[PDB]
Amino acid sequence: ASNLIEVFVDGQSVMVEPGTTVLQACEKVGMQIPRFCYHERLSVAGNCRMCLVEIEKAPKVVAACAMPVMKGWNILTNSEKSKKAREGVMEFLLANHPLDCPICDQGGECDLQDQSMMFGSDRSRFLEGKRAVEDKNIGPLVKTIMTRCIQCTRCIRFASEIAGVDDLGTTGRGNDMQVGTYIEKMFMSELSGNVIDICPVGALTSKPYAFTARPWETRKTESIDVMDAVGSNIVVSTRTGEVMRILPRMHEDINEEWISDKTR
């Protein structure tokens, strides 16, 4: 065990490298910690607070997406504290999330809905009025309904790091902090449908794909893109014998998790 440290997930021992996060150790064991702001190809943000898990003999839950395992830690992923933290965080998200699910392109593809059903509570205590945010016009490709945005900064981190445009960001403070562009700026670079991919809520949707189909009815066909000579692995989403969508496939040696705008 040279340059390896032993940690425990639910009592199960596992060797990890130094610098390995709690979430990375948990997925090495085989459990996927809930997440909204963590993306394995984006920088670590640590703001959605959904990856809060309880370490044994530790009074405060830690964020698995950012905290590295130290030594001999027993990560109680399915503990009462972790379940209560997940329930509270989903309650806080859905307090101001808008009731837009039937009119949402993220129908069955919603990480927020699925993680609600899997970890959150089944009812609301929010008796107040929800906030509403005006929409933006960043281009004819990405349709923005920013009321659904949960401010996870995934699009901002993607545009800063991979697209390399530094055009998106958060303007304001507190509950009024809005993701977008401060000026009327048209966000059109290449590799710009991947914000539609990585937006977990249906805030950034595809405008050609707008109101067309549903993920449960779309059939998935794993094919190759021919628009350039990179050969990106893709999924053609076809419903009733008609090509409805193009999505990327995870291939670490060709295109990672993304496809070009022309391809998409």
Partner: protein, 214 residues
């Protein structure tokens, strides 16, 4: 009240004439030299504050000018300008009265101060007088709580206020004089009223109570 979405208007399009004076360029150079090399993006806040102090408010042309001077993204400049509350993204009056309404000032009755300002200026909170001389807003704790109630006019703190005192300050500002900062209740600073409970004796001086071996 304010909206963190820019709308192109003839008075706030990205073509309004803004440029730093040579003195302000020297000040910007001093700030950048204060910060370490390769981290000149840290100078966004002082340069934006200098632009606000030069121009009054902060137009989008001034914000883009700050961005192009510091070689930083204009969206990063917009993020700073929308996050921080002392940056005026709309034109304000000559005197920007900020009345603190946090809990100890409320206990010491800043509500009467706010009501007397509203009746004296003929305006509500958050709006500007038609002569563009006074803007009146509510703010959080300004850091002078033992001198409650208190207001901030531009860079000056007017403390220990009464309705008569704030009316006199408004009259002095309308006449064009300097009302002079500090408390108006007769005490010079945060000291207890009606005498000193501490620091009555003179200070001991240098080399008092120094431990051995120093």
């Amino acid at each position: 009240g304010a909206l963190f979405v820019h709308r192109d208007t003839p008075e706030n399009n990205p073509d309004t004439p803004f440029d730093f004076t040579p003195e302000n360029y020297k000040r910007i150079e001093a700030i950048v030299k204060n910060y370490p090399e390769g981290h000149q993006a840290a100078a966004v806040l002082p340069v934006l504050d200098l632009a606000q102090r030069q121009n009054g408010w902060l137009p989008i042309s001034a914000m883009n000018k700050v961005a192009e001077v510091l070689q930083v993204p204009p969206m990063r400049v917009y993020e700073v300008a929308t996050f921080y509350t002392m940056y005026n993204r709309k034109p304000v009056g000559k005197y920007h009265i900020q009345v603190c309404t946090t809990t100890p000032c409320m206990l010491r009755d800043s509500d009467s101060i706010l009501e007397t300002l509203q009746r004296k200026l003929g305006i509500k909170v958050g709006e500007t007088t038609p002569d563009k001389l006074f803007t009146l807003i509510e703010v959080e704790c300004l850091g002078a709580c033992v001198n409650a109630p208190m207001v901030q006019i531009n860079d000056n703190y007017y403390e220990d206020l009464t309705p008569k005192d704030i009316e006199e300050i408004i009259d002095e500002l309308k006449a064009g004089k300097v009302p002079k900062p500090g408390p108006r209740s007769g005490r010079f600073c945060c000291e207890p009223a009606g005498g000193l409970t501490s620091l009555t004796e003179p200070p001991k001086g240098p080399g008092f109570g120094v431990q051995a071996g120093l």
